[PDB]
Scaffold this active site. Sequence first.
Site, PDB file in Angstrom:
ATOM      1  N   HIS C 222      21.018  -2.949  -1.809  1.00  0.00           N
ATOM      2  CA  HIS C 222      20.670  -2.373  -3.112  1.00  0.00           C
ATOM      3  C   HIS C 222      21.913  -1.603  -3.570  1.00  0.00           C
ATOM      4  CE1 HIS C 222      18.935   0.576  -5.834  1.00  0.00           C
ATOM      5  NE2 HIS C 222      18.715   1.497  -4.908  1.00  0.00           N
ATOM      6  N   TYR C 256      17.777   3.750 -11.902  1.00  0.00           N
ATOM      7  CA  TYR C 256      17.436   5.181 -11.773  1.00  0.00           C
ATOM      8  C   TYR C 256      18.721   6.015 -11.728  1.00  0.00           C
ATOM      9  CZ  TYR C 256      18.109   4.537  -6.588  1.00  0.00           C
ATOM     10  OH  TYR C 256      18.578   4.250  -5.335  1.00  0.00           O
ATOM     11  N   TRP C 358      10.424   4.793   2.817  1.00  0.00           N
ATOM     12  CA  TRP C 358      11.396   5.473   1.931  1.00  0.00           C
ATOM     13  C   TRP C 358      11.590   6.928   2.334  1.00  0.00           C
ATOM     14  CZ3 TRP C 358      11.127   3.804  -3.916  1.00  0.00           C
ATOM     15  CH2 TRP C 358      11.324   2.401  -3.958  1.00  0.00           C
ATOM     16  N   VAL C 359      12.733   7.545   1.982  1.00  0.00           N
ATOM     17  CA  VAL C 359      12.861   9.004   2.218  1.00  0.00           C
ATOM     18  C   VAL C 359      11.664   9.741   1.610  1.00  0.00           C
ATOM     19  CG1 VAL C 359      14.061  11.003   1.266  1.00  0.00           C
ATOM     20  CG2 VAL C 359      15.395   9.174   2.431  1.00  0.00           C
ATOM     21  N   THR C 360      11.263   9.291   0.419  1.00  0.00           N
ATOM     22  CA  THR C 360      10.116   9.859  -0.319  1.00  0.00           C
ATOM     23  C   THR C 360       8.845  10.053   0.517  1.00  0.00           C
ATOM     24  OG1 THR C 360      10.872   9.093  -2.449  1.00  0.00           O
ATOM     25  CG2 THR C 360       8.529   9.293  -2.263  1.00  0.00           C
ATOM     26  N   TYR C 536     -26.179  -5.250  10.293  1.00  0.00           N
ATOM     27  CA  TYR C 536     -25.080  -4.586   9.611  1.00  0.00           C
ATOM     28  C   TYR C 536     -24.803  -3.290  10.340  1.00  0.00           C
ATOM     29  CZ  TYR C 536     -22.602  -1.997   5.914  1.00  0.00           C
ATOM     30  OH  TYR C 536     -21.647  -1.296   5.174  1.00  0.00           O
ATOM     31  N   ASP C 549     -16.790  -1.746   8.287  1.00  0.00           N
ATOM     32  CA  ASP C 549     -18.203  -2.170   8.370  1.00  0.00           C
ATOM     33  C   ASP C 549     -18.237  -3.634   8.815  1.00  0.00           C
ATOM     34  OD1 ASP C 549     -17.342  -3.007   5.765  1.00  0.00           O
ATOM     35  OD2 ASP C 549     -19.347  -2.829   4.915  1.00  0.00           O
ATOM     36  N   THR C 551     -20.792  -7.198  10.162  1.00  0.00           N
ATOM     37  CA  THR C 551     -22.120  -7.769  10.395  1.00  0.00           C
ATOM     38  C   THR C 551     -22.065  -8.459  11.767  1.00  0.00           C
ATOM     39  OG1 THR C 551     -22.406  -7.970   7.951  1.00  0.00           O
ATOM     40  CG2 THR C 551     -23.956  -9.099   9.261  1.00  0.00           C
ATOM     41  N   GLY C 563     -18.856 -10.669  11.315  1.00  0.00           N
ATOM     42  CA  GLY C 563     -18.201 -10.771  10.005  1.00  0.00           C
ATOM     43  C   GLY C 563     -17.438  -9.467   9.865  1.00  0.00           C
TER      44      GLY C 563
END
Lengths: 104, 827, 827
Positions: C222, C256, C358-360, C536, C549, C551, C563
């Site tokens: 980049h 940016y 990311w640093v973020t 369920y 969740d 089944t 499931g």
Amino acid sequence: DVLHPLQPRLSPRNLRVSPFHARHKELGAFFLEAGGWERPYWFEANAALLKEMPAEWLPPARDAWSGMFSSPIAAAEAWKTRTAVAMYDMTPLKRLEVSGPGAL
Amino acid sequence: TPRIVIIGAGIVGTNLADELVTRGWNNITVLDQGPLNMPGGSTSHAPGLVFQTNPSKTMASFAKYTVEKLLSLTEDGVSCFNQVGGLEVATTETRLADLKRKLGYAAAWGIEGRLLSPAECQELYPLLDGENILGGLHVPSDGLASAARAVQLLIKRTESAGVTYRGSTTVTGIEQSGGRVTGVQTADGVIPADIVVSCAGFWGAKIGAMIGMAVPLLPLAHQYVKTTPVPAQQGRNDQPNGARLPILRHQDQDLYYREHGDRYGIGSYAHRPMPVDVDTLGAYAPETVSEHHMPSRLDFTLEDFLPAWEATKQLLPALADSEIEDGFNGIFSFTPDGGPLLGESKELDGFYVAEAVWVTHSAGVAKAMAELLTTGRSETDLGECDITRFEDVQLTPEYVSETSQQNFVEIYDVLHPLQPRLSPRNLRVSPFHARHKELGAFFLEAGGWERPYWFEANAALLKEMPAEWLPPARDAWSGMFSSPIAAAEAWKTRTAVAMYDMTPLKRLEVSGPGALKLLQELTTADLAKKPGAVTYTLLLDHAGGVRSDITVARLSEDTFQLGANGNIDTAYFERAARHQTQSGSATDWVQVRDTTGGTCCIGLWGPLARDLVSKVSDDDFTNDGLKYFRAKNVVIGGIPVTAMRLSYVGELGWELYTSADNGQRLWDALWQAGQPFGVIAAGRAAFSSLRLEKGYRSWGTDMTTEHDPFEAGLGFAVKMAKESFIGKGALEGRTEEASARRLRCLTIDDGRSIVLGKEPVFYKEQAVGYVTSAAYGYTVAKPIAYSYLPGTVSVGDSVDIEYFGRRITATVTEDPLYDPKMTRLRG
Amino acid sequence: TPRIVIIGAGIVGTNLADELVTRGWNNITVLDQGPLNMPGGSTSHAPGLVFQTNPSKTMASFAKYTVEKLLSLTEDGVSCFNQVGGLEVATTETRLADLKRKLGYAAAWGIEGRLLSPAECQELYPLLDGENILGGLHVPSDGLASAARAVQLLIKRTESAGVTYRGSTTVTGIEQSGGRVTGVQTADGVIPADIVVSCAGFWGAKIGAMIGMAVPLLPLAHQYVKTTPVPAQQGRNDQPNGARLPILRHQDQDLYYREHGDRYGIGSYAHRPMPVDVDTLGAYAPETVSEHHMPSRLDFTLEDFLPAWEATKQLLPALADSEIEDGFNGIFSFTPDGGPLLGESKELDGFYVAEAVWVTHSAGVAKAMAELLTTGRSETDLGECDITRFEDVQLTPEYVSETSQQNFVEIYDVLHPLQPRLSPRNLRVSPFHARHKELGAFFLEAGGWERPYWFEANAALLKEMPAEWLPPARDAWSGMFSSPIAAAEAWKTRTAVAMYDMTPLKRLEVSGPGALKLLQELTTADLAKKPGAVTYTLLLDHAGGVRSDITVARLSEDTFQLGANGNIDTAYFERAARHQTQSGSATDWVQVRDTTGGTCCIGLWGPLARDLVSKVSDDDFTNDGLKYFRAKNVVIGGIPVTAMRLSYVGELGWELYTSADNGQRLWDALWQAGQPFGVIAAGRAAFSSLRLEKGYRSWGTDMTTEHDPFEAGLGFAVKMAKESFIGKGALEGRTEEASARRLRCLTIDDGRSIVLGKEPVFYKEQAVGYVTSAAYGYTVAKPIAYSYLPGTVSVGDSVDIEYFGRRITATVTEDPLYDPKMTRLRG
Ligand SMILES: *Cc1cc2c(cc1C)nc1c(=O)[nH]c(=O)nc-1n2C[C@H](O)[C@H](O)[C@H](O)COP(=O)(O)OP(=O)(O)OC[C@H]1O[C@@H](n2cnc3c(N)ncnc32)[C@H](O)[C@@H]1O
Ligand SMILES: *Cc1cc2c(cc1C)nc1c(=O)[nH]c(=O)nc-1n2C[C@H](O)[C@H](O)[C@H](O)COP(=O)(O)OP(=O)(O)OC[C@H]1O[C@@H](n2cnc3c(N)ncnc32)[C@H](O)[C@@H]1O
Ligand code: NA
Ligand code: NA
């Protein structure tokens, strides 16, 4: 060579097809050819009807020669034409238009 | 010896009790719901015609044994077989030709017979109207069984030897513990058993439901009629059931005949199928059972017999001076493939079936089952008889009803070996099905799977095919379910690259910490190698006979993928796995799964296969990347694939396996990549021909449990140095060179006369073998046929193969016929 | 506490060491191949822009924590965060609308922000040329991270607490025994470890190959450029890297910006994707690593930056009086879905990843991983972050390369939540694919599977559909990847009969003598019932949060079919099964298999479902034949099927399961049988709407591990009477009625303003929730949305949902909205 009267060429084929060709292939058409046109002789979809066909419609066994390019499916197609309703492709039959004040 | 309960005192159950007693097992109880003097199943109504000649070697052998045994069963100087001979007549040219094929079976299986001219038929059977007779097949050793009398004589001599018979005793359930049978339930309590054998005739599916087992037979009714006294027959035979003329088949009209003193008996299959619901028959109080009143006999329906009666008067005009006296609609069993149902149930250890058996084969079935119970194996190949041969879609009530009714309709028809059913079809398809239909696949079916035999798209290649690849014209019979397109598909497999659909080939996964242990004992290979090896190996029985050939791939420490022959293999591994798990430690557990239906496989084969795959994969497919008979995981077209380097057709390339959901993508990726290399889809006709050119053995045809590996030429697949494996002891000292009979490759000298299978093979005018696998070899440009031959016949010797009564000269040839030095496979 | 080795001293690894130390785990060694003063990975070149607002709640929370933590990290009175705020500007109407959606995310996740007019943007950021500016989004709390300084301050304070740092140390392998990690290999020997965490940035796939683990990141380059001193900036900021203006995003041009004293920094994604082969970088001797010479920085390619430079001069004309000073092409990681890769490896116990971050988000990821290691769970939902989320086709090098490059190309694009990729597609298809294409399916994709959202064949029904079913017009955004055809499919499901393709829903088989034991501990149900029950149930973590969740169908004593929600579930069961087997007896072994790709499922639903199936099956489908929430084996169209009676859409009928090879036949049989009943194929758009009308909760959206069952309204699925199950202790005493926050059903009052998900929900003008699942309800004829709300908000109360900056009035409604008395399901 010894050849049956219905023996098709394997090439060239599919030169002329009717507008129903894709639907015919969905139904398992068995095609032979004349004048360049591909013509279904029976449809494999109809094999599923043989088990409910009344016994009077079932033909006897065929010998090898008369059995070439033939199927028992054709009996079912005859049965349903006589007792229900059937759709035949008549597209290949020669169609001429004669027009003008001199046509009659 | 084990405590045995047999359910049924028909001809099967009583012969089984007798065959067990002769082998020193006499701790047997035989049960029947009917009275012992006349049990009331199908045996109590059968007229007893025995025609030995059959397309199946096993069934012919069962019939020959039945004739021998019934002739031996005697009291008061009268045996249970009246050896009048048998005559099959032909009224059409189609049937006349089929009798020449049947004369071939007779020679192959060791039954003496002759083709008769119309005049000879008239000399033998004077009542025939000779005008419509075109010829006949005469087998002097056929004849009439006295089945009810045989049951009574078997009961007498087995009772003397210690067998217990309990008539008037209805089995209502089966007792079990720990997955094994322990007893048989009746209204009066449980009869204990270590082994139970269901010999219950057409009640076989009702018995099977008692243990949750699907028994694929259908009860159906069949008409049999007796006439009033026939004037032409006055004074000729002993009364009341004497017979002097051969039993008579009139297969063109679905009829058979025998004499009953001066009356005729007429059996007809020339009526609508008549399925019977066994639950509606009603329970017969045993005191009420009599000749005309028994569970197996339903009311006669005259309207169904009228056409048969007319055809009878045409064939045998003397009968027009008699009348119908009595008829009935008699119940017996039919199955999806016309074979019987023998062997141990999947659901319950120690519970066996021996059902859907004609009187004709009854003593042979009983002998085979006695051998199975007392030694662990039958001396006769049961591959076509084993109850475990069926796939799951073939066991539904709907499938069994439809296909068994069709088997009844076709029972006496002339049929080609490749003849497909027209329904039910499309039960099982591979992930490539839509692409196959785009390419004009011609599909035939086996085990429920739709399998392309060739592709109409490839017809366009014939005009550029080199002349050396074009085969000669075929005759009508060998031309059925065949196409010249197959030559083009063979040509392109040998010279370009082809995609075969291998999805239907049985695929098992054997997994768990006990997987290696299980396979080390069951197979003839040392499989204890680091993962990645693919090994061709055999499964033997304890006598060293070949139960199966298998390809084993070790995918990880505890997972193996097996290529097998069918559901007999599946059931064999399932039970062996369960037994090892049950008796083993925490490290011995093993699971077996049939993964065929959830996965798919493309065989990518031909000299351009590396060029093609290199366009859609970054994995290394060179010799250093993947050696012969190795497997590894790769990615092709974005799809995870297990690639195995081997080829049934003898060319460069790989079997490529993936999950069903990924199959269409894998197909399309390879297809697109293959366009510049002229890739084609290739079908089973070419596949079979190319594989036979490589000398591949097909289990069930080229070898069965009747053959050891050395006789079959598979010695290379047996590692005799292994410490232990089933069959090792039996094989000690045996070699290919010392084998009395050896499997040989024959090529047909005229380059054109194709044979199909089962034709007898002659050496210096003596029958010494029969054709196992056969195909036209497109690369060698001649018909190929395999046969066992005496060890003294050598490569280069000449033999004759009889096809429709004509002797075809063939040469014993070294195999493989193609690339025996494997140049196409290596590097 | 356990001995830990962290690989990597970037911003992730050093924050992880710090987060472990704070939790009292200090037996940690951190390794880096680079010098500790400047390791040389991506952290050593990042400019540090932190924009917190994100569509993902989890990522927004990670960013908020990073800002908080970096502001707290200080030495000499200077922190590691310069809180200049952040401004995103819009130059198109499309972008302007998307900023209103983003203001919605900000409110949903608790970040303060404001939309600014062009004039306000100019006041805030005077260097903008205001002519092309349409508006901006201003978030005052965004700003600039000093990532390299943070690493140094974290190293200092963790070293004081006992952490060992070893720079100049290259990991060459990973040591293991018994399926668990035991050490880390270097040229100088093995460093012992109970736990290893790979924090290796873009070298993550290279580390993963050391244990046979696929790590789906792609190293990509980049561009980042600094200008010469900008004349307009003379004298304004502290030298040399001061900044006073908000960080600036110009997403319409993929750019940016930040200040560096009087110079500008420009980041550009407006160039071709630049994949990097990590094996070509060369090993850097640690003594050579410096600001302009480090593994993460490649030579600048000016030709790729020219368009970005032109777009920069247009936005910020003052920069036209400067020049490019220095640029580089900097390497970091992208993934197929833009999410990070966290959690425990499938291949090796005790080996974890924390990569593609990311640093973020760095401090938030580290906190979550510290929570996972020290307690067994993260306090933040990691469903979008877990490495096990990927399907097998999504892990191939080819898939990871193509999709991660597309993620780079699209990084700053405005995209609809349903936007599909155009390639790669058609990786996984069900057995019904050709039939679906015949019917004009509109396919979208998830997990590699092609899934019909509606069928063009059904457009022909709209002209006969009753007016009550016709929805109003949709706006452009909610109309994307939507059709009015879905109303017709809902209409026919509610009034006739429909066939849904349920094949892609994750299907697991759990088998073995230990299967019941495993599931009894992992789930909230008592599953010890005779086979045939469908239950369920929930999977919890030890804090009582909802992991999934499920089944469960008990098909036999030792086989269960589940499931599930996806491959996080698969990996969870795989490891739990292996651990039970390893530590258990001979009776405790259990296998887990993902059978999805080998099987298929049709949901046959609607009031005419019994009429349809009765034509193709003789099995009993009445209430007495198969009760609600039960399963049994049946035959349909000749195919063996496992039928389960339940319905996501709330109508009569069954889920019908079979093997892939049988699927097309099953489809065709049902299709033909359904013709007189008006059967249709129905797609995911109708499915989702009908299921939401039934109040179904979708895991990952309507509940995550952040919620307990009672908050979600799933209390009925927890059997608190069970002796033992994961999470039981945490749930003691909890109820739905006492829950501080509860999941509520909202309906949109105007009947037309459809919302999609993530929109903030307001009660008396305060943000108190956000939209989880949403759809137009065709039966109730209005838009539906779910949200958690404070427990004091009741049924009947009014709330506002913000959609593209407009407040939509909605009512808290009792659910299910359709047939809450289950009349359609019973009998
Ligand atoms: C019906 C028929 C059959 C037939 C034939 C003509 C007709 C009209 N012509 C034949 C021919 O000429 N040549 C030939 O080879 N076979 C011919 N057949 C067929 C033949 O009759 C049968 O295939 C054969 O008889 C079958 O024998 P099997 O021993 O297998 O069967 P079975 O006689 O029916 O005996 C079964 C016994 O089991 C008892 N049973 C059933 N259920 C129970 C329970 N629950 N409990 C106790 N006992 C049970 C029955 O009572 C029966 O006796
Ligand atoms: C390149 C880039 C990145 C970037 C950016 C601009 C450019 C041009 N701008 C950003 C922005 O303004 N805001 C933001 O939030 N992030 C921005 N980034 C991305 C950011 O730099 C990265 O995502 C982040 O720095 C990644 O941190 P992480 O700690 O995960 O990774 P790392 O710094 O690369 O550290 C990994 C360490 O592992 C060591 N390693 C690797 N292999 C080994 C072996 N075998 N043995 C020992 N050590 C190893 C490396 O040496 C490295 O130090
Ligand atoms: Na017939
Ligand atoms: Na872009």
